[PDB]
Short mmCIF file of C-alpha atoms in Angstrom, two decimals:
data_model
loop_
_atom_site.label_atom_id
_atom_site.label_comp_id
_atom_site.label_asym_id
_atom_site.label_seq_id
_atom_site.Cartn_x
_atom_site.Cartn_y
_atom_site.Cartn_z
CA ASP A 1 159.80 68.69 33.18
CA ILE A 2 159.82 72.36 34.43
CA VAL A 3 163.68 72.61 36.06
CA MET A 4 163.70 75.10 38.69
CA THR A 5 167.28 75.59 40.00
CA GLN A 6 167.94 77.48 43.55
CA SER A 7 171.41 79.93 43.95
CA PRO A 8 172.79 79.05 46.40
CA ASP A 9 172.45 75.88 48.15
CA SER A 10 172.96 76.73 51.39
CA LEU A 11 173.05 80.41 53.49
CA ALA A 12 174.20 81.27 56.72
CA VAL A 13 173.39 85.35 57.84
CA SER A 14 173.39 86.45 61.75
CA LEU A 15 170.09 86.86 63.43
CA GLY A 16 168.16 90.45 61.95
CA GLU A 17 170.35 90.23 58.68
CA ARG A 18 168.50 90.55 55.59
CA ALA A 19 168.24 86.89 53.60
CA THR A 20 168.70 86.15 49.91
CA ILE A 21 167.29 83.24 47.91
CA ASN A 22 166.90 83.01 44.12
CA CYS A 23 165.36 80.53 41.80
CA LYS A 24 165.02 80.04 37.54
CA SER A 25 162.47 78.02 35.86
CA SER A 26 163.71 76.24 32.70
CA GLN A 27 160.63 77.40 31.09
CA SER A 28 158.62 80.89 31.80
CA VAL A 29 155.73 80.31 34.34
CA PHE A 30 154.17 83.77 33.40
CA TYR A 31 151.21 84.29 31.99
CA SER A 32 150.29 87.25 30.23
CA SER A 33 147.08 87.17 29.92
CA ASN A 34 146.77 87.71 33.92
CA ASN A 35 149.78 88.29 34.26
CA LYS A 36 150.21 86.18 37.11
CA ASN A 37 152.78 83.75 37.87
CA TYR A 38 153.10 79.84 38.44
CA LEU A 39 155.83 80.29 41.59
CA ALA A 40 155.51 79.09 45.39
CA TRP A 41 158.11 79.50 47.86
CA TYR A 42 158.21 76.54 50.48
CA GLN A 43 159.38 75.97 53.92
CA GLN A 44 160.15 73.08 55.57
CA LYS A 45 161.65 71.85 58.29
CA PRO A 46 162.82 68.22 60.16
CA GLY A 47 160.79 65.57 60.78
CA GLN A 48 157.46 67.99 59.01
CA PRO A 49 155.79 68.77 55.83
CA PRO A 50 156.42 72.16 53.18
CA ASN A 51 154.47 74.92 54.81
CA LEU A 52 153.68 77.93 52.36
CA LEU A 53 154.42 81.43 51.89
CA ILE A 54 154.74 83.22 48.94
CA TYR A 55 151.77 82.41 45.87
CA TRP A 56 151.52 83.51 42.55
CA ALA A 57 155.16 84.30 42.88
CA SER A 58 154.97 87.60 44.97
CA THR A 59 151.69 86.87 47.46
CA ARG A 60 151.57 86.01 50.80
CA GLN A 61 149.57 84.12 52.67
CA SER A 62 147.66 85.85 54.83
CA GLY A 63 149.50 84.31 58.42
CA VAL A 64 152.44 84.30 57.13
CA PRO A 65 155.35 86.67 59.05
CA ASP A 66 155.22 89.73 56.86
CA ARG A 67 159.10 89.81 56.89
CA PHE A 68 158.92 86.96 53.88
CA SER A 69 158.43 88.35 50.74
CA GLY A 70 158.93 86.77 47.38
CA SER A 71 159.62 88.69 44.04
CA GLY A 72 160.02 88.37 40.46
CA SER A 73 158.52 87.50 36.59
CA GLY A 74 158.92 84.93 33.65
CA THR A 75 162.42 82.49 34.65
CA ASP A 76 163.72 84.83 37.40
CA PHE A 77 162.41 84.33 41.43
CA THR A 78 163.62 86.01 44.37
CA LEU A 79 162.40 85.38 48.08
CA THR A 80 163.50 87.60 51.01
CA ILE A 81 163.16 86.92 54.38
CA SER A 82 164.47 91.12 54.95
CA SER A 83 165.32 90.14 59.07
CA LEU A 84 166.26 86.84 59.69
CA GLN A 85 165.03 85.47 62.78
CA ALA A 86 165.69 82.32 64.55
CA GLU A 87 162.95 80.19 63.58
CA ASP A 88 163.52 80.27 60.20
CA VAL A 89 166.28 78.27 60.01
CA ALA A 90 164.67 75.93 57.49
CA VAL A 91 165.30 74.14 53.30
CA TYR A 92 163.57 76.89 51.40
CA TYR A 93 161.81 75.39 48.28
CA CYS A 94 160.28 77.38 45.04
CA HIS A 95 157.93 75.21 43.04
CA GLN A 96 155.79 75.72 39.49
CA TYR A 97 152.35 75.16 39.01
CA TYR A 98 152.24 76.08 35.18
CA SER A 99 152.62 72.52 33.70
CA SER A 100 152.90 69.08 34.49
CA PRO A 101 154.46 67.33 36.16
CA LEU A 102 154.48 69.74 38.67
CA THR A 103 158.09 70.95 40.34
CA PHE A 104 160.18 71.98 42.94
CA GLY A 105 163.49 73.18 43.34
CA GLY A 106 166.07 71.45 45.29
CA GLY A 107 165.91 73.96 47.57
CA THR A 108 168.29 76.28 50.00
CA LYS A 109 169.20 75.37 53.39
CA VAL A 110 169.55 78.80 55.89
CA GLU A 111 171.48 78.84 58.71
CA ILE A 112 172.26 81.12 61.37
CA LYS A 113 176.14 82.10 62.42
CA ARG A 114 176.45 83.26 66.49
CA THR A 115 177.99 83.59 69.10
CA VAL A 116 180.23 80.64 70.28
CA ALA A 117 179.32 78.76 73.34
CA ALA A 118 180.74 75.59 75.13
CA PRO A 119 178.16 72.45 75.16
CA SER A 120 177.33 71.66 78.18
CA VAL A 121 178.02 67.61 78.52
CA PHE A 122 175.95 64.92 80.30
CA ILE A 123 176.73 61.44 81.11
CA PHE A 124 174.00 58.30 81.50
CA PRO A 125 175.33 55.38 82.86
CA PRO A 126 173.59 52.21 81.35
CA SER A 127 169.84 51.28 82.38
CA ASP A 128 169.57 48.50 85.02
CA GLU A 129 166.91 47.17 82.76
CA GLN A 130 169.01 47.33 79.65
CA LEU A 131 172.02 45.46 81.67
CA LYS A 132 169.13 42.75 82.45
CA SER A 133 168.89 42.11 78.55
CA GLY A 134 173.34 41.11 78.36
CA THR A 135 173.91 45.05 76.71
CA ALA A 136 175.08 48.23 78.03
CA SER A 137 174.96 51.20 76.16
CA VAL A 138 177.02 54.27 77.97
CA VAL A 139 175.24 57.76 76.62
CA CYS A 140 177.41 61.52 76.39
CA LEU A 141 175.11 63.97 75.65
CA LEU A 142 176.82 67.36 74.10
CA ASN A 143 173.58 70.06 74.70
CA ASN A 144 173.18 73.24 73.02
CA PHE A 145 176.79 74.51 71.35
CA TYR A 146 177.76 76.59 68.49
CA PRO A 147 179.63 76.23 66.41
CA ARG A 148 178.33 72.68 65.18
CA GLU A 149 181.88 70.76 65.35
CA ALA A 150 182.77 68.91 67.72
CA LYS A 151 185.04 66.09 69.19
CA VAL A 152 184.21 63.01 71.65
CA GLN A 153 186.51 60.22 72.29
CA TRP A 154 185.67 58.03 74.87
CA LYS A 155 187.96 55.96 77.97
CA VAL A 156 187.25 53.15 79.45
CA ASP A 157 189.70 52.68 82.68
CA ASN A 158 191.86 55.89 81.25
CA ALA A 159 192.55 53.99 77.59
CA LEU A 160 191.12 55.96 75.08
CA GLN A 161 188.34 53.62 72.90
CA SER A 162 187.54 52.42 68.88
CA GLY A 163 185.21 51.40 67.26
CA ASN A 164 182.36 51.31 69.84
CA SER A 165 180.50 54.20 69.42
CA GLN A 166 178.20 55.68 67.02
CA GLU A 167 177.18 60.38 67.32
CA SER A 168 174.83 62.23 66.05
CA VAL A 169 173.77 65.61 65.51
CA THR A 170 170.47 67.40 65.79
CA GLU A 171 169.66 70.31 63.04
CA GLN A 172 170.20 74.08 64.78
CA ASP A 173 167.59 75.14 67.06
CA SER A 174 164.61 77.05 66.23
CA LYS A 175 165.43 79.44 69.76
CA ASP A 176 168.66 79.70 70.47
CA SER A 177 170.50 78.56 67.36
CA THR A 178 172.65 75.60 69.10
CA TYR A 179 172.78 72.09 67.95
CA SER A 180 173.23 69.63 70.86
CA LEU A 181 175.13 65.37 69.98
CA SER A 182 174.67 62.41 71.15
CA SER A 183 177.27 59.65 71.86
CA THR A 184 176.69 55.91 72.83
CA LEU A 185 179.36 53.72 73.29
CA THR A 186 178.08 50.04 72.67
CA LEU A 187 179.57 47.70 75.25
CA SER A 188 178.34 43.66 76.09
CA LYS A 189 176.96 43.38 79.57
CA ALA A 190 180.56 41.51 80.58
CA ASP A 191 182.78 44.20 79.42
CA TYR A 192 180.97 46.80 81.29
CA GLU A 193 180.81 45.02 84.51
CA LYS A 194 185.17 44.33 83.74
CA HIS A 195 185.71 48.27 83.26
CA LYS A 196 185.52 50.59 86.00
CA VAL A 197 186.00 54.29 84.75
CA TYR A 198 183.92 55.73 81.70
CA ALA A 199 184.73 59.05 80.36
CA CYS A 200 183.40 60.85 77.84
CA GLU A 201 186.67 63.46 76.76
CA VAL A 202 184.66 66.53 74.51
CA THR A 203 187.54 69.19 72.62
CA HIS A 204 185.31 72.40 70.64
CA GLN A 205 186.15 75.19 70.09
CA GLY A 206 184.00 77.39 73.34
CA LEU A 207 187.25 75.08 75.46
CA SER A 208 190.56 76.02 76.45
CA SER A 209 191.16 72.39 76.62
CA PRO A 210 189.06 69.35 76.53
CA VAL A 211 186.32 68.56 79.31
CA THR A 212 186.16 64.72 80.28
CA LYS A 213 182.47 63.72 81.75
CA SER A 214 182.51 60.35 84.00
CA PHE A 215 181.07 57.77 86.05
CA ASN A 216 182.76 54.76 88.00
CA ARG A 217 180.74 51.67 88.02
CA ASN B 1 150.61 78.88 28.54
CA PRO B 2 149.80 77.40 31.91
CA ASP B 3 148.19 74.07 31.76
CA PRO B 4 145.05 74.11 33.71
CA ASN B 5 145.14 70.32 34.41
CA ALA B 6 148.44 70.26 35.97
CA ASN B 7 146.92 71.30 39.62
CA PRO B 8 143.52 71.75 39.33
CA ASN B 9 142.69 73.74 42.75
CA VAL B 10 144.28 76.22 40.46
CA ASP B 11 141.24 78.49 39.75
CA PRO B 12 142.36 81.96 38.99
CA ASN B 13 139.78 84.87 38.28
CA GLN C 1 140.05 73.16 60.81
CA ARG C 2 141.72 72.41 57.97
CA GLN C 3 143.47 68.65 58.35
CA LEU C 4 144.65 65.59 56.34
CA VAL C 5 145.52 62.48 58.28
CA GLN C 6 147.36 59.87 57.48
CA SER C 7 148.40 56.06 57.85
CA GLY C 8 151.70 55.67 59.68
CA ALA C 9 154.97 54.14 58.52
CA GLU C 10 155.46 50.70 57.26
CA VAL C 11 157.79 48.77 55.58
CA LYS C 12 157.15 46.52 52.60
CA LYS C 13 159.39 43.99 50.53
CA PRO C 14 160.60 44.61 47.24
CA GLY C 15 158.41 43.75 44.69
CA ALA C 16 154.73 44.02 47.32
CA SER C 17 152.60 46.86 47.22
CA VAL C 18 151.74 49.66 49.76
CA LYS C 19 148.47 51.47 49.98
CA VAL C 20 148.79 54.74 52.36
CA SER C 21 145.63 56.31 53.90
CA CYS C 22 144.96 59.95 53.88
CA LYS C 23 142.06 60.99 55.69
CA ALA C 24 141.04 64.50 55.21
CA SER C 25 138.62 66.61 57.46
CA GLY C 26 137.22 70.15 58.32
CA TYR C 27 136.60 71.21 54.40
CA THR C 28 134.48 70.10 51.82
CA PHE C 29 136.21 66.40 50.72
CA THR C 30 134.41 66.50 46.89
CA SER C 31 135.83 70.84 46.05
CA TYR C 32 139.46 69.79 45.71
CA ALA C 33 142.01 67.92 44.48
CA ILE C 34 144.69 65.87 47.04
CA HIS C 35 147.94 65.47 45.64
CA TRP C 36 150.98 62.93 46.87
CA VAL C 37 154.28 64.00 46.84
CA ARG C 38 157.22 61.57 47.62
CA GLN C 39 160.64 62.91 49.98
CA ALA C 40 163.23 60.28 49.53
CA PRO C 41 167.20 61.62 51.01
CA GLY C 42 168.25 64.13 49.73
CA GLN C 43 166.11 64.31 46.82
CA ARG C 44 163.95 67.39 45.40
CA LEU C 45 160.80 66.26 46.19
CA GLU C 46 158.36 64.47 43.58
CA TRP C 47 155.04 65.33 42.24
CA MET C 48 153.34 61.23 42.00
CA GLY C 49 150.03 62.86 41.10
CA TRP C 50 146.56 64.19 42.25
CA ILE C 51 142.91 62.45 42.41
CA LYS C 52 140.08 65.04 42.25
CA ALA C 53 138.08 63.68 44.88
CA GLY C 54 134.80 64.88 43.71
CA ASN C 55 134.74 62.11 40.95
CA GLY C 56 137.73 60.82 41.57
CA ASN C 57 139.83 61.73 38.40
CA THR C 58 143.32 60.93 37.95
CA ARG C 59 146.74 61.96 36.88
CA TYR C 60 149.76 60.32 37.18
CA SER C 61 153.04 61.26 36.80
CA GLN C 62 154.83 59.87 33.81
CA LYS C 63 157.45 57.88 36.45
CA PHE C 64 154.45 56.20 38.35
CA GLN C 65 151.67 55.52 35.80
CA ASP C 66 152.66 51.79 35.79
CA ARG C 67 152.84 51.06 39.36
CA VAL C 68 150.73 54.03 41.16
CA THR C 69 146.85 53.80 42.00
CA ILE C 70 145.09 56.77 43.15
CA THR C 71 141.31 56.15 44.38
CA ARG C 72 138.83 57.52 47.03
CA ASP C 73 136.15 57.26 49.54
CA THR C 74 133.88 59.93 49.95
CA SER C 75 131.95 58.84 52.12
CA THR C 76 134.89 58.24 54.90
CA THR C 77 136.48 61.33 53.31
CA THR C 78 139.44 59.66 52.29
CA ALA C 79 142.13 59.16 49.93
CA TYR C 80 144.41 56.94 48.79
CA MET C 81 147.54 56.27 46.78
CA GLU C 82 148.96 52.14 46.25
CA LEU C 83 152.72 51.56 44.78
CA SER C 84 152.96 48.65 43.33
CA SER C 85 156.24 46.46 42.02
CA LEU C 86 158.10 48.05 44.78
CA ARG C 87 161.75 48.61 44.75
CA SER C 88 163.88 49.27 47.56
CA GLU C 89 164.54 52.90 46.19
CA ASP C 90 161.06 54.04 46.72
CA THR C 91 161.82 54.23 50.48
CA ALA C 92 160.60 57.53 50.99
CA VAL C 93 158.20 60.06 53.00
CA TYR C 94 155.05 60.03 51.22
CA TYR C 95 153.02 63.06 51.47
CA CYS C 96 149.35 63.39 50.42
CA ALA C 97 148.65 67.76 49.92
CA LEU C 98 145.95 70.29 48.56
CA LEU C 99 148.47 71.98 47.01
CA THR C 100 148.20 75.16 46.66
CA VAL C 101 143.83 76.07 46.81
CA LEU C 102 143.85 78.84 44.64
CA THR C 103 140.83 79.89 43.68
CA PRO C 104 137.80 82.92 43.73
CA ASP C 105 136.64 81.93 47.51
CA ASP C 106 139.62 80.06 48.54
CA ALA C 107 144.01 80.02 48.90
CA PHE C 108 145.09 77.84 51.29
CA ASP C 109 147.79 74.60 51.03
CA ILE C 110 147.97 71.72 53.54
CA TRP C 111 150.14 68.41 54.21
CA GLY C 112 149.81 65.42 55.92
CA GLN C 113 152.58 64.88 57.91
CA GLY C 114 153.47 62.62 56.07
CA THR C 115 154.54 58.49 55.75
CA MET C 116 157.13 56.97 55.39
CA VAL C 117 157.03 53.41 53.23
CA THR C 118 160.88 51.61 53.68
CA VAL C 119 161.05 48.81 51.51
CA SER C 120 163.25 46.15 52.52
CA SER C 121 163.80 42.26 52.76
CA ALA C 122 165.35 43.19 56.30
CA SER C 123 162.88 41.70 59.36
CA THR C 124 161.17 44.07 61.21
CA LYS C 125 162.14 45.06 64.69
CA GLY C 126 160.72 46.83 67.57
CA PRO C 127 162.77 49.00 69.55
CA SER C 128 164.28 48.23 73.69
CA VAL C 129 163.20 51.84 75.64
CA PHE C 130 165.48 52.43 78.83
CA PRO C 131 165.71 55.06 80.70
CA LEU C 132 168.32 57.79 81.00
CA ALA C 133 167.69 58.48 84.56
CA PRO C 134 168.80 62.17 85.95
CA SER C 135 171.65 61.65 88.02
CA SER C 136 174.45 63.82 89.45
CA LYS C 137 176.15 63.18 86.40
CA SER C 138 173.52 64.78 84.30
CA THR C 139 172.86 68.08 85.90
CA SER C 140 174.12 71.41 85.65
CA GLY C 141 173.17 74.89 86.71
CA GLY C 142 169.99 74.30 88.38
CA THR C 143 168.77 72.36 85.16
CA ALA C 144 168.87 68.67 84.97
CA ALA C 145 168.65 65.84 81.64
CA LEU C 146 166.89 62.99 81.40
CA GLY C 147 166.12 60.89 78.72
CA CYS C 148 165.46 57.75 76.65
CA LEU C 149 167.36 55.91 74.80
CA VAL C 150 165.21 53.77 71.80
CA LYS C 151 167.68 50.59 70.71
CA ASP C 152 167.70 47.88 68.23
CA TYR C 153 164.16 49.20 65.59
CA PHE C 154 164.07 48.60 61.66
CA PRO C 155 162.94 50.33 60.20
CA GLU C 156 162.84 53.95 60.64
CA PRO C 157 160.89 55.91 62.56
CA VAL C 158 160.15 56.28 66.25
CA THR C 159 158.70 59.15 67.27
CA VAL C 160 158.70 60.18 70.53
CA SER C 161 157.27 62.73 72.69
CA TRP C 162 157.29 63.74 76.44
CA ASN C 163 154.19 63.91 78.52
CA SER C 164 151.65 63.30 76.18
CA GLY C 165 152.79 66.14 74.26
CA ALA C 166 152.58 68.06 77.02
CA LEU C 167 156.50 69.06 77.47
CA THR C 168 158.17 70.50 74.22
CA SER C 169 160.32 72.80 75.51
CA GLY C 170 164.00 71.75 75.95
CA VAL C 171 163.32 68.53 74.33
CA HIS C 172 165.79 66.89 72.10
CA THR C 173 165.16 63.90 69.81
CA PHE C 174 168.01 63.12 67.87
CA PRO C 175 168.16 61.46 64.60
CA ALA C 176 168.57 57.87 64.87
CA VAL C 177 172.34 56.19 63.72
CA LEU C 178 172.70 52.81 62.28
CA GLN C 179 174.09 49.73 64.34
CA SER C 180 176.45 47.51 62.77
CA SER C 181 173.79 44.97 63.06
CA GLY C 182 171.59 47.43 60.51
CA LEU C 183 169.04 48.26 63.10
CA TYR C 184 168.44 51.85 64.25
CA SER C 185 169.14 53.93 68.05
CA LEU C 186 168.03 57.21 69.13
CA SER C 187 167.67 58.86 71.94
CA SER C 188 165.70 61.43 73.16
CA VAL C 189 166.75 64.10 75.92
CA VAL C 190 165.30 66.82 77.77
CA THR C 191 166.46 69.38 80.46
CA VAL C 192 163.76 70.45 83.31
CA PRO C 193 164.04 71.87 86.94
CA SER C 194 166.99 70.22 89.04
CA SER C 195 164.06 71.28 91.73
CA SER C 196 161.69 69.86 91.29
CA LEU C 197 162.78 66.05 90.16
CA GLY C 198 160.43 65.30 93.19
CA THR C 199 157.04 66.19 92.26
CA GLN C 200 157.65 66.15 88.33
CA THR C 201 156.49 62.85 86.04
CA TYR C 202 158.48 62.73 83.10
CA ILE C 203 157.55 60.36 80.76
CA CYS C 204 158.49 59.14 77.07
CA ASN C 205 155.93 57.38 74.64
CA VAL C 206 157.38 55.98 71.99
CA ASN C 207 156.04 55.09 68.76
CA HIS C 208 157.48 52.78 66.05
CA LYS C 209 154.37 52.13 64.42
CA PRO C 210 156.01 49.14 61.89
CA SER C 211 155.88 47.09 65.06
CA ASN C 212 153.00 48.41 66.59
CA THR C 213 155.05 48.97 69.59
CA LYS C 214 153.49 51.98 71.92
CA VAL C 215 155.86 52.20 74.51
CA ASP C 216 155.11 55.06 77.59
CA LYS C 217 158.64 54.80 80.13
CA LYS C 218 158.53 56.90 83.09
CA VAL C 219 161.98 58.41 83.82
CA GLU C 220 162.76 58.08 87.38
CA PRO C 221 165.87 60.01 89.44
#
């Protein structure tokens, strides 16, 4: 196995800044006969296959933006993004096709640092359609905030909840470099009908004190 | 030297 | 345009077999080798093998050689990967790919969209799809948020589009969460102009291939 080792595992720079990714192969992928290095670089975003950026170590594929360039030879290779754009947040992988089995590096996650942005907070009562089935899910949405750290707390009838909610955060947005978060409070229909006030309380760096979004059933 | 059967799609000049 | 289109996500029991298809179009099928590559959670991409689409010769990774069969059908320009004696640890996204075509006449690299295969003893369950209606509680500064809650399915994944793909700006389809039951749930939301809620129609298109679920839910104020 030609082991491909990437450094660093993750990097964060501001919009427009240079980004450098290193890849080391355990065996030289250089062939003196044709002066080529048998190495490629791929970009992968969540839910998509990898996309080829550079091959033969340093030949950028036509149609790939020219801010992407590859360099190096033998066992040491470098991917450079000269001016990181919002759409370039992704995991980048090196790849060797010198020997079998073909192998890939462990990846370098490239991220944008940007200014603070407070979440926009929305709340969705359970749908009448769901209520017919005996369950009641309340959704709290935190939209387009930065940085990623955020705290959601649920209150039912002004009392803090525990153990009955699940949340997930998006990948970094390819346009504005923010994150979004969805949290669901899952209740029985009977419990939902017994209470009046449903509230999502959000703590975030962009907020001087927590924001509560609520509705009365 | 490269293994030319690692990936048959690789066929440089 | 050169493309590879894979079969939909599947779920199989431990010890069963799975067969993923890879339909090729837009190039001379018999000229190139199709590779299979899998991507397991937080694991590096793993090359599994290749087939020459012309003569059908193969090469398999040592890790899979006793369990994998890659075949092709030139008449239908389709390649297939079959993995037998499935482990729950074979749960992964499986890709077919024309990896680095680098010849005197061509330089391209094409991947299928991936096929998620889950190996589990648990029962497939199709999701319920509920609207997240726009309301006074989901509007801020001239925009309104609306969405679909896709609740209680197994296994992953569920795909969500809006207006058959014509609505992509402002969409966030969130990673799924695991319920205590062991079923998954995800939310898909979109921010739209508040001014036009009375004239525009917003429909979330929800697919869960393992359960043959295809739901189009209209989300109204």
